[PDB]
């Protein structure tokens with residue numbers, strides 16, 4: 166008898182397929198039981214952090230790429246998957262993708278899929294507005310006035326949570342200036358004080374121009390998951406800047422026959438880089454101190470490589486990196502080039518994207534600080550100037566703690 170625990174996050178579609186994969190795995194291995202621990206994204210890292218701090222984390226965990234510095238600065242924070250290569254077919258995964266999940270020579274997770282935030286739009290609402298999807302940053306900014314006037318005050322081209330906004334304005338700044346956002350060598354942000362003023366001024370411009378809800382307006386609804394909010398469901402918030410790897414969590418909640426459709430990616434004339442936040446979407450990792458590394462490795466291999474596991478899991482985590490899995494799903498007609506998640510990935514790959522985001526750009530305290538910052542602007546407690554200086558100062562402080 167081997168008892169394993171596995172955690173993951175996601176929407177209920179992902180919960181469904183994962184649970185069904187676990188029953189097959191157990192059917193194939195009567196001596197191995199897996200206790201499933203799953204939630205939505207909200208608070209998931211917080212809960213795992215508490216487990217790891219106390220040494221009680223699961224045997225198998227779905228993990229995020231920005232968590233590697235948080236838990237595994239020296240690469241020993243998760244079990245070294247090179248040590249279980251007998252059970253786990255590593256050759257299915259591109260070596261450059263494995264490099265992204267390797268730390269000090271130790272393989273900390275198997276990357277499941279890749280992803281980038283891109284624009285997806287509610288086709289029903291945009292048709293009502295009579296507008297085509299923005300092809301430029303100018304058209305995005307201009308869409309807000311059209312939505313507000315043609316459809317009504319409650320209508321917005323997109324909705325953006327603060328993390329989405331942080332990535333979006335970074336993309337714009339990368340297009341303009343072609344420099345990394347984080348200066349990893351000097352453990353600090355790379356932007357001049359002027360560029361930070363520009364960053365927050367763009368936010369203010371977008372809010373003023375009715376592109377997306379302000380934080381104050383968003384709060385007036387304001388606590389469920391974004392994809393479960395009424396103005397999302399009914400099409401009033403007509404788009405999202407979101408991972409292709411989890412786009413059905415969003416599209417599944419729209420009101421038929423509305424669909425989420427892939428939009429253009431705005432590119433500044435003369436930009437050398439799109440400034441995508443492009444990364445491994447998520448990983449499967451093994452607990453550092455698991456008493457069952459081999460059985461844990463068997464479970465990962467089953468989910469990511471086995472015919473039954475791949476079939477069960479389908480596309481709920483995006484387009485598989487595993488060569489056998491992605492071939493299988495194309496062959497079964499599950500992967501369709503016209504599907505917004507697949508099309509979104511293909512568009513992103515063709516965009517010039519040589520700049521790779523630092524994992525510290527997605528440090529959760531940096532992301533939280535950003536939310537506080539824009540809230541200061543929207544609630545009239547700091548000017549754009551004061552907010553920029555505050556973000557630069559407090560962010561550099563967080564980065565120093567994060568990168569120690």
Ligand SMILES: O=C(O)[C@H]1O[C@H](O[C@@H]2[C@H](O)[C@@H](O)[C@@H](O[C@@H]3[C@H](O)[C@@H](O)[C@@H](O)O[C@@H]3C(=O)O)O[C@@H]2C(=O)O)[C@H](O)[C@@H](O)[C@H]1O
Pocket residue numbers: 174175206207229280326327328329390391392408410411414445446447482
């Ligand atoms: O495919 C995935 O599950 C995805 O998970 C991570 O992204 C999380 C979250 O799961 C995403 O839905 C998205 O979350 C939304 C907002 O962007 C976020 O700021 C927060 O408000 O919650 C929203 C939500 O719950 O849907 O973005 C999240 C994030 O980027 O942290 C991984 O990061 C991602 O790569 C992928 O595995």
